[PDB]
Amino acid sequence: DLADLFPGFGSEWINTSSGRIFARVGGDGPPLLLLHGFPQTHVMWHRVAPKLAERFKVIVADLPGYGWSDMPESDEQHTPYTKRAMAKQLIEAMEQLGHVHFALAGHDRGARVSYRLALDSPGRLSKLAVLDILPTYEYWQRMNRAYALKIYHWSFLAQPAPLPENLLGGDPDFYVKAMLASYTRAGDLSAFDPRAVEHYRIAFADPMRRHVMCEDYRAGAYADFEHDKIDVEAGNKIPVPMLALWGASGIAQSAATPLDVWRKWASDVQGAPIESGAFLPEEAPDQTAEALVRFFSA
Amino acid sequence: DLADLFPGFGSEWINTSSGRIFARVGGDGPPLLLLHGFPQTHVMWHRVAPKLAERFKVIVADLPGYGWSDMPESDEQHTPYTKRAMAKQLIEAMEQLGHVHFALAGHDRGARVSYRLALDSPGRLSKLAVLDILPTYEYWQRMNRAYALKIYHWSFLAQPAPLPENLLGGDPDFYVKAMLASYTRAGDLSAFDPRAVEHYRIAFADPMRRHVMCEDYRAGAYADFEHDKIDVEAGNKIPVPMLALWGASGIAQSATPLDVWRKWASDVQGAPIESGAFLPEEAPDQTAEALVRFFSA
Ligand SMILES: *[C@H](Cc1ccc(C(F)(F)F)cc1)C(=O)O
Ligand SMILES: *[C@H](Cc1ccc(C(F)(F)F)cc1)C(=O)O
């Protein structure tokens, strides 16, 4: 019922102690993990993954609780869907494949999993790439009226259950599509493959998957923030050589000077703006792929 | 049929150029206007209004677009549901009854209509009372992680249509009940009268009324903010002698309310009340006496 946007890629259901992680696996060479964000799945990499496959062994994984990944039971602190736990679970997953030192690239929620992984376990990463994000700490500290209105859903979805859930039940199709079109450059869905939008909408049409997304944004308003406050108070920087890509019309640039912020969180960081909205790998696939290939190859 | 929580009070469909304002009207003496808020209707004053009617001509009106008042067609800048436009419409309504200089008390959304009225047309108000609020500018300007999480619906309901409307249409009864409960001390509907809740529920059950509420919160995120900002930068303060009532466990106090209003008013008194956000329904007696003692000085 859902299209194949990764021709040639296999399908792996990697076992962890918190549940199965689904991923499309293609190419050969150095291991490169790709992590998606909200409200998308692994298929958001379908326009750049084949190019990366020509050079690397590309693992395109659904986040814990997302897509076809299992949904581990959450708790009163939203632990399994905190960026620290997600990182632990994916580290565990990559160990099942023999990948204990790999390249990592993330977008939105996946980028947050990524930099948290780098802080907690720098050893697991050769190079890091974060796409159109700032540290979760940075958004909350810089929170103003402009901030609050634009990215309203950081506060909205972090509301205690079942208030966001019950509201999302009203028109999940509309909401998930609105979340996609609102952060592009054109303001519509033209950037997204209609088949890819189907993957997103189908997953979002399930109440259980939506609950996970809320538990995600709850973690991002509490545990993730507290985890980030500890680091920023200690003065810990990410030692992993990392790349920061953001859309010129993206979310991160309206907030701050992206590479100036990431220089405060990482000692070895380079970055560039790309003519795009928030959804870089779909809006500007050629440039995004090129940036990643050249960076991970160096 | 909805309950009549105002024994003796007549009903009024007051014509304005922007549409009819419904109000319950009772008592006699100096004229006193009561303006409700979100997500309520005029029946929120039902526990304190009779006490007030012993000494005043009490006019309990539904805000334009709210409850039983008509719904003026809105526009791209949400003009008719800005606080400036609401105040003008109510000034018209009061002028119909022969009231061109009156006393005014407001809560939540209505209190924003009220101080905006004080700023734009100070001559219209003998005395002013605002309940459990800060100026709209103050909330947006002091926005942080805490306020983002604590009062999220300022940003959520302000999202461009029809994003909030389509979400609210799913489970409207749940949302309106949660909104009433969440800001009380007990965190339930126990402080409210069931019949009052049904008034709030039925109104909130109409999708057109729900759209009006969003237009209200859209105005409060933009045009209202900008209007307030103009007064901040120009050093304009409310000359109308006012009283700032707020709940000790309410929304307004979670800043030091009296200090904030002193920046906005050159003659303002302030006192806390053992209550959540809905003082006239959580602490009706303390609110009743405070209002009576203030407008009767
Ligand atoms: C996805 C949306 C998003 C993206 C980027 C930022 C910021 F401000 F950090 F750059 C905030 C929100 C997500 O929630 O991660
Ligand atoms: C009603 C809810 C409300 C009340 C008071 C405040 C604050 F923080 F300004 F005092 C915010 C929100 C309303 O929408 O005004």
Side-chain angles (χ1 to χ4, degrees), chain A residues 2-50 52-149 151-181 183-263 265-293 295-298, chain B residues 2-75 77-273 275-292 294-297:
Chain A
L2 296 184
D4 192 347
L5 299 157
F6 296 83
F9 278 59
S11 298
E12 304 290 19
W13 304 74
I14 319 167
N15 293 321
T16 75
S17 69
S18 312
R20 298 185 302 190
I21 289 286
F22 179 81
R24 302 301 302 269
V25 173
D28 54 86
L32 166 63
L33 176 57
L34 308 186
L35 299 178
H36 71 87
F38 168 91
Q40 305 194 284
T41 65
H42 73 278
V43 302
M44 69 158 280
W45 299 97
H46 82 90
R47 264 200 189 93
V48 314
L52 294 164
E54 301 171 7
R55 299 292 229 90
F56 298 89
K57 193 224 186 183
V58 181
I59 298 99
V60 198
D62 285 335
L63 285 183
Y66 282 79
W68 297 334
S69 284
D70 289 329
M71 295 174 288
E73 186 194 56
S74 185
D75 50 71
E76 49 286 337
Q77 280 76 46
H78 335 291
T79 303
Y81 305 100
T82 64
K83 307 309 167 288
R84 173 164 288 165
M86 293 192 187
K88 286 173 184 175
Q89 185 176 350
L90 291 168
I91 285 172
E92 200 164 45
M94 293 295 279
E95 274 180 330
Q96 306 287 309
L97 304 174
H99 304 320
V100 294
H101 190 75
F102 45 93
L104 180 56
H107 180 258
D108 200 63
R109 310 312 285 179
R112 308 188 180 282
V113 176
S114 296
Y115 80 78
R116 174 43 62 191
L117 200 155
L119 288 161
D120 289 6
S121 310
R124 301 283 177 166
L125 302 185
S126 50
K127 292 195 233 298
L128 178 56
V130 294
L131 269 65
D132 198 77
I133 71 137
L134 308 174
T136 280
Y137 173 83
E138 294 294 343
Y139 179 91
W140 289 113
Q141 276 287 314
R142 230 170 299 234
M143 174 80 72
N144 55 23
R145 169 179 164 269
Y147 261 62
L149 286 173
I151 315 301
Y152 75 98
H153 59 290
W154 270 39
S155 301
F156 166 64
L157 303 166
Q159 296 301 307
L163 184 147
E165 283 93 342
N166 292 342
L167 281 169
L168 285 170
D171 202 337
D173 284 20
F174 175 89
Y175 190 90
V176 64
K177 293 219 269 190
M179 237 65 218
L180 297 170
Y183 299 130
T184 60
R185 187 145 53 98
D188 47 22
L189 294 178
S190 58
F192 308 102
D193 198 290
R195 298 169 303 180
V197 182
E198 185 60 11
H199 273 267
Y200 312 143
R201 187 191 70 90
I202 283 310
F204 202 85
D206 167 33
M208 277 195 289
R209 298 291 171 178
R210 291 194 301 260
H211 174 57
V212 157
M213 302 173 197
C214 292
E215 293 291 305
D216 187 345
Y217 278 96
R218 287 184 182 104
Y222 294 108
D224 295 332
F225 174 80
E226 294 300 347
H227 292 162
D228 281 18
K229 181 205 279 188
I230 299 294
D231 287 318
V232 80
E233 279 172 9
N236 301 137
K237 283 179 170 55
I238 293 181
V240 172
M242 80 176 302
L243 172 67
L245 303 174
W246 65 93
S249 303
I251 303 185
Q253 55 81 39
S254 70
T257 306
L259 68 172
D260 282 344
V261 174
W262 279 107
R263 278 189 215 295
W265 284 80
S267 48
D268 194 345
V269 52
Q270 63 185 260
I274 295 170
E275 183 160 347
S276 158
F279 301 92
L280 233 55
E282 289 173 291
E283 290 189 73
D286 305 323
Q287 310 94 289
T288 302
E290 262 286 320
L292 295 180
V293 174
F295 170 75
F296 281 132
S297 296
Chain B
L2 294 173
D4 180 22
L5 299 175
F6 299 90
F9 288 64
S11 295
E12 295 283 353
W13 299 91
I14 316 171
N15 302 328
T16 76
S17 59
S18 293
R20 305 172 310 173
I21 300 303
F22 179 79
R24 295 302 303 266
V25 170
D28 60 283
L32 169 62
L33 188 63
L34 302 174
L35 295 179
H36 75 86
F38 173 91
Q40 314 195 276
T41 65
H42 73 275
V43 304
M44 59 142 282
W45 298 101
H46 81 276
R47 285 223 182 91
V48 306
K51 200 88 183 65
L52 292 167
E54 304 168 9
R55 301 192 176 188
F56 299 101
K57 188 64 172 179
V58 175
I59 309 178
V60 207
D62 278 328
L63 289 189
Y66 279 79
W68 284 14
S69 294
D70 296 332
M71 289 172 284
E73 185 184 346
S74 196
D75 55 277
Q77 296 86 48
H78 324 298
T79 293
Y81 299 109
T82 61
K83 305 305 153 287
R84 178 165 290 166
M86 286 189 179
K88 293 183 179 185
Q89 183 167 0
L90 289 159
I91 283 176
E92 296 197 27
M94 293 294 284
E95 262 204 8
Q96 292 285 296
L97 301 172
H99 302 140
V100 301
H101 181 77
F102 50 94
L104 172 62
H107 174 264
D108 196 77
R109 303 314 288 188
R112 311 189 180 280
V113 179
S114 297
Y115 78 80
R116 172 46 51 192
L117 200 157
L119 287 168
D120 295 342
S121 313
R124 295 284 176 179
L125 304 188
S126 61
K127 276 199 169 74
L128 178 61
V130 287
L131 277 69
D132 198 46
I133 68 141
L134 305 167
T136 291
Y137 175 87
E138 292 296 330
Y139 168 84
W140 282 121
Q141 199 64 17
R142 292 158 181 257
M143 172 65 55
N144 57 23
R145 170 168 167 263
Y147 291 165
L149 290 176
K150 247 166 176 57
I151 329 292
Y152 81 101
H153 57 284
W154 275 54
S155 301
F156 165 60
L157 303 175
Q159 295 307 291
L163 195 150
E165 287 84 352
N166 287 1
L167 298 187
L168 291 176
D171 202 339
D173 293 336
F174 170 76
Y175 191 93
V176 62
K177 286 182 183 177
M179 278 301 160
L180 296 172
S182 51
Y183 297 136
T184 50
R185 282 183 301 177
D188 55 11
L189 306 182
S190 63
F192 307 97
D193 187 281
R195 301 168 295 172
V197 175
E198 183 60 16
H199 271 271
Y200 311 143
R201 203 194 57 79
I202 286 303
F204 203 88
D206 180 24
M208 290 194 303
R209 299 294 179 172
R210 237 146 43 206
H211 174 54
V212 163
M213 301 174 198
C214 293
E215 290 299 289
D216 176 16
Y217 276 91
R218 288 190 188 98
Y222 293 94
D224 281 345
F225 171 79
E226 303 289 349
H227 292 175
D228 283 10
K229 186 177 180 183
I230 293 298
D231 288 314
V232 171
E233 295 164 346
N236 295 335
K237 299 173 69 172
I238 299 177
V240 174
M242 56 176 274
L243 166 59
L245 293 182
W246 74 86
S249 318
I251 299 178
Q253 59 85 18
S254 64
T256 317
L258 190 54
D259 289 281
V260 169
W261 282 109
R262 281 191 194 297
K263 284 133 61 70
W264 291 82
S266 52
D267 184 21
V268 53
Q269 297 176 271
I273 280 188
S275 163
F278 304 88
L279 285 71
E281 291 181 289
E282 295 189 50
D285 301 323
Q286 304 90 313
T287 303
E289 63 185 28
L291 292 183
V292 167
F294 179 59
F295 295 116
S296 307

